[PDB]
Design a protein around this ligand. Structure first.
Ligand SMILES: COC(=O)Cc1cc(=O)[nH]c2ccccc12
Ligand SMILES: COC(=O)Cc1cc(=O)[nH]c2ccccc12
Ligand SMILES: COC(=O)Cc1cc(=O)[nH]c2ccccc12
Ligand SMILES: COC(=O)Cc1cc(=O)[nH]c2ccccc12
Ligand SMILES: COC(=O)Cc1cc(=O)[nH]c2ccccc12
Ligand SMILES: COC(=O)Cc1cc(=O)[nH]c2ccccc12
Lengths: 217, 217, 217, 217, 217, 217
């Protein structure tokens, strides 16, 4: 990655970072919590480091191929926004990055450093991570095993356990933060068992999740 | 986080910190000791780092949704206290943070750095951690399985084991430090078994916990 | 903790330190070797770091409550020795610490830093660790399962194994270094089995432990 | 390796790096993901460090012998491109590296440092790693157990599982990124089971992998 | 310990060092290889750090008591060599260390730092480690289970295995490097089985260990 | 070891290095890959550090005694090459190292530092490591269980598995890189099974190992 000692300098990706990423993917596959873990392990990442982390995954090649497809789409839209002059470059001067330069396929580490450490920075690392996360979210959703519609409380299931499944499903199904805030007063109640549902109805509306979990405890 | 090398500079959250947090949550869920562990692992945390740690939790989505609700409440009270001018910002100048800027949802890492490293600091990291801990304590209490009233010494249970359950329950039930200091001379004795209770009564009042544990050893 | 880079600056307590402390307590409870381990893991600790380490212990709440009682006693004796002027403080100036300021309950991290890094230092970290260790030794002794009087050599037990139990018991029972130096020529021999006891008597007095262990090998 | 503290200086290869490399080879042998792992663990590597990592592998001596053969070929082509003057060297001056100097067999660490830290650098580390990776890819391909032609979807096999095997096989068989982009619309469909194949045909052409995986879910 | 950043400054003993020492003692007890491990883990150690490492051992209290006895003897001989003036000390000036100051029982960390960082250094750490190792060697020897005289090659035992037991026993029995160099041509042969003994005799004298192991392979 | 912060300064050998060395010896004994691992773990090692690593090995005392014998031989040849003047040394001046000074038996750490950090360096660490590796290779060869002559392909054994055993045996038997390059066209074929041997003969000469492994796949 790029970090300050100080000044902004390139640092070797650590065995710890490399191992942490591979292990989280081995253990959790594309459970949605893997995404913010990817983001935090890739703190300060050059595009080279981002390729390194993705390339070190041995499984999930279906997913990695879908991710390439997402990255080419984003790359093509970059090149539509920021077309570069095809003429040869000014001696000693910074060339403008292309989609494939951001994706690290046609850029060197040195060019990647040049861009990221420029005043002001061309943040090719951050632009690329954005594309990658956009792609990883598609895969979380694809790999989401269960519709929120099939998350219903078992007659003998503690409410808290039911709500954990519900909001875990909502997260993988990529429901917006609004519909997460809103499903409380709608589908969470409708999908609750009769006993708890009766209690929840009687709370009336405006009931916090904390109050609902209290009520059906 | 933000640390001194020196001067105050941003540092990538470490794989060790990320792994430690996820593991403590996997092993201990919302046992009350998880809170001061969260606090210490989040030493120097930007709001981004605080979101990162919370977002890396894969389970307990019921709890994480309750936490959002706590954070929106605190955020709304911040905005009631410190309303910001809605006009566009002075070129090159620090804008005032809003509730959602402190929660890291509408603020950039750079703005978060600007605030935290300002002279004097606007400690958005520390303000946010406060909100989060307030929220985590609600969840400790919610997840507390047992009323102090049902912590009674078994006829064959060593007093020390009984007292460990008692003060563990009191801690999860969020009893104040006063009522922790006071329950000694009241409920600890009443909830003790007949044999030990007889010994404890005969100590008279003002008996330290050390003296009571000695007495019923 | 506080360390030199250099100059004296505050450093985040490490996940390694946090994990090491919790693990030693999980594995060893209040075996006496846990105390010097606590001392060494808490090298350079602010009172905040000392609270952090104690607060991260999930079990042993009986012990943690006894420790508070020890800390309040020490705190009250501090305040008897070093009463502070109750008037408001000189702008920009260091206030004098109270018992509860040393225990970290009424002091901020910044005040704790101010004191510890002052010329000369007010070593609130070291004063507090002293109180805590005083409290932990009471708990070692309380939790000591066995009187030295019941450490007797089995007829078939190697002398070395008997001496390991004896000096392990003496350590937990908090016997002074004198009585550790002295019990050799008295209780170690009396508690030895007949066979070895006969050999030990015949050594006459002034026999080193090394000579006694040699003699009964 | 060589890193900046600062200035460019030699650093001992870490036990962590050494252990990480040996463990990845023990666990994964020559699965293609081992190559980018080798590349990232060898970040900043001198040729000495590259020999060290390869030499620490205890198994796979067939592969290590093939790798030497690749390295001698590359070395011979270097010497064809950059023949060196056989006359004795200018006192105190940098000699030109030969194929075997790049491979670290006839060069000292100091000469390797001289070259890599020269203005401008002679990047013998990077030139050698290139040769090594060229050699490792031959071995990935050799060790590839299965022709893409024998990756066919089982009648009861989830499409996603079939696609994971397909793109895992394509990767080990070293198929170009074009033929990875292209096999989607050809062999992936032909090798799909009848049920899914019928669905895929009906998508018509231009179907993304994401759409195909959706369609046969 | 004391290290250079730079200049000579005090550093907290690391959790890694603390854990490494306790684990080596748990796994190996007083096998002779534990001594050079103790020496290397205690690199740069103040007497405080040396007490810390010894104090963190939970078992082997027989051994730890023998070690105190060794340390008091060495301490008493120090005080015989370097008696100190009993008069009060020159304000702001370095006092001379006593036996118990070197053993860390009557010295502060600051005094220990003063001595060790003085120009020239009073190396109380190194003087104390010497005493401790002297004491640990007595314990290795005491704890040595087997006389070299009972190391005899089994009729079916590979010579190499016999020699490993022989030189392992010699090491624990603290045989000098001379008698290690010499026992080759004497007791190693006499303690060898008849078959190998016949071969070894026929080598004649001056046979290296390498030649003897070759001969009886 | 000795490293640059910067300037050349002494550093404590790390618990990680100490543990890594002991573990590699516990797991792999004297498999030839242990040697380059020893070399890399001993990067920057003083002779003291080299003694430390060898001394921390608890097993293999037969081997460690053979190693001493190798080191005395090398030491005696050093003293034949570089005899030192037996007169007392120039006050404040660097004495010349003897064989036993290089082996760390008669030299202090400070003298070892003086030599290694001198302008220009007297590289006693590197000279000693050379002696040690020379000695370790003798032991690899001694401990080599199997003649290359007994590495023959089983009728049902994959060629690749046969070649792995062959080149693993060649490595332990310390065959030169020439005879490793050459045995391909000779003994590898002769020791191959009839089926594969027939294929290999028909390749004619000049067949790379890659072509032979392809041919008999
Ligand atoms: C479409 O652009 C790319 O292929 C970027 C890329 C480069 C690389 O080296 N490995 C990847 C792995 C998985 C997804 C993407 C990539
Ligand atoms: C209500 O404000 C938030 O949603 C703050 C927040 C942001 C985020 O990225 N993840 C969270 C996870 C768990 C609770 C909160 C948050
Ligand atoms: C009596 O003073 C205290 O309560 C000090 C203290 C503070 C804290 O945050 N946690 C503790 C845990 C265990 C014993 C003590 C404390
Ligand atoms: C052909 O050039 C080499 O032999 C380079 C080389 C040197 C070394 O020390 N170990 C190796 C291990 C495995 C492949 C190669 C090498
Ligand atoms: C005789 O001098 C000592 O007691 C030195 C010493 C101090 C300490 O704190 N712990 C020890 C543990 C084991 C042997 C010795 C000591
Ligand atoms: C012959 O010279 C030596 O004995 C060098 C040496 C010193 C030491 O402290 N330990 C060793 C262990 C194993 C082989 C050698 C040595």
């Amino acid at each position: 990655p790029i970090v300050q000692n100080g000044q902004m300098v390139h640092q070797c990706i650590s065995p710890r970072t490399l191992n942490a990423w591979v292990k989280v993917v081995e253990e959790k596959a594309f459970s949605p919590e893997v995404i913010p873990m990817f983001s935090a392990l890739s703190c300060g990442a050059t595009p080279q480091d981002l390729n390194t982390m993705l390339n070190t995954v041995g499984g999930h090649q279906a997913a990695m191929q879908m991710l390439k497809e997402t990255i080419n789409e984003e790359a093509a839209e970059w090149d539509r926004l920021h077309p570069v002059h095809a003429g040869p470059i000014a001696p000693g001067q910074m060339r403008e990055p292309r989609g494939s330069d951001i994706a690290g396929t046609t850029s060197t580490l040195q060019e990647q450093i040049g861009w990221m450490t420029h005043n002001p920075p061309i943040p090719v690392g951050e632009i690329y991570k954005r594309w990658i996360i956009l792609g990883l979210n598609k895969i979380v959703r694809m790999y989401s095993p269960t519709s929120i519609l099939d998350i219903r409380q078992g007659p003998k299931e503690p409410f808290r356990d039911y709500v954990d499944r519900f909001y875990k499903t909502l997260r993988a199904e990529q429901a917006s933060q609004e519909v997460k805030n809103a499903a409380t007063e709608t589908l969470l109640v409708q999908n609750a068992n009769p006993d708890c549902k009766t209690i929840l109805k009687a709370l009336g509306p405006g009931a916090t999740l904390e109050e609902m979990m209290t009520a059906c405890q």
